[PDB]
Amino acid sequence: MNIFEMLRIDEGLRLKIYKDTEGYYTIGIGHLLTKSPSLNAAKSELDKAIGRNTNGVITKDEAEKLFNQDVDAAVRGILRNAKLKPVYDSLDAVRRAALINMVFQMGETGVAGFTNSLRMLQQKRWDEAAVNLAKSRWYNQTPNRAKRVICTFRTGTWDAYK
Ligand SMILES: *SCC1=CC(C)(C)N(O)C1(C)C
Ligand SMILES: [Cl-]
Ligand SMILES: [Cl-]
Ligand SMILES: [Cl-]
């Protein structure tokens, strides 16, 4: 298991524009196109992202290209953020993947706001952090996915993904 395999499980793979759990246009492996309600707007974003006039449909290779970019972007977002970098630096490789997962789903700014959870993670108080993370819109709206991520923080193993 690794961050790519982990997110592939959590996000799935779809080659045509679809709406994610929040109702936002998305494609590939959890690649958010836009929060705009306009499908035309989403198609424009797709064309711009892929570099060609698509039909709202991409290839698997193209999906994986966006995925590579998105994972890299999540890591880069963590390392540039004053709140997230210290936490990331303090973690083992498995829990680092869990943090990348959260940033992939919710964005840098969103996760950076989890001030109390982040403190508990940096303190390595895993059970308490797990309880605190569950007190969130994140957990309530995507409980199974959040449970997997939280379990990863709790145990520092990949047990939730096996
Ligand atoms: S939350 C991760 C976890 C570890 C283990 C003790 C194996 N579990 O049963 C759960 C799923 C609670
Ligand atoms: Cl998804
Ligand atoms: Cl709550
Ligand atoms: Cl879920």
CA distance 39 to 64: 22
CA distance 68 to 50: 13
- Domain around 27: 1-162
The structure was resolved to a resolution in Å of 1.8
Taking the centre of ligand 4 as the mean of its atom positions, its distance from the CA of residue 143, in whole angstroms, is 5
Q: Are 11 and 29 in contact (CB under 8 A)?
A: yes
Taking the centre of ligand 4 as the mean of its atom positions, its distance from the CA of residue 112, in whole angstroms, is 21
Taking the centre of ligand 2 as the mean of its atom positions, its distance from the CA of residue 22, in whole angstroms, is 10
CB burial class (10 A; 0-12, 13-18, 19+) of residue 129?
buried
Q: Are 26 and 39 in contact (CB under 8 A)?
A: no
C-alpha to C-alpha distances, 97 to 74, 101, 133, nearest whole angstrom: 10, 6, 16
Q: Is 158 helix (H, G, I), strand (E, B) or coil?
A: coil
Question: Measured from the CA of 151, which atom of ligand 1 is nearest?
Answer: 1
CATH number for the domain including 90?
1.10.530.40
**45 catalytic residue (yes or no):** no
**10 catalytic residue (yes or no):** no
In the chain, the number of structural domains is: 1
Q: Are 132 and 139 in contact (CB under 8 A)?
A: no
CA distance 11 to 119: 27
Q: Are 62 and 28 in contact (CB under 8 A)?
A: yes
Annotated binding site for substrate: 32, 104, 117, 132
DSSP string, 55-119: -SB--HHHHHHHHHHHHHHHHHHHHH-TTHHHHHHHS-HHHHHHHHHHHHHH-HHHHHT-HHHHH
Q: How was this structure determined?
A: X-ray
Which ligand is the nearest neighbour of the Cα of 21? 2
Q: How many CA atoms lie within 13 Å of 101's alpha carbon, on the beta-carbon side?
A: 27
The single-letter DSSP state of residue 54 is -
* Residues paired with residue 25 on neighbouring β-strands, in sequence order: 19, 34
Residue minimizing CA distance to atom 2 of ligand 1: 151
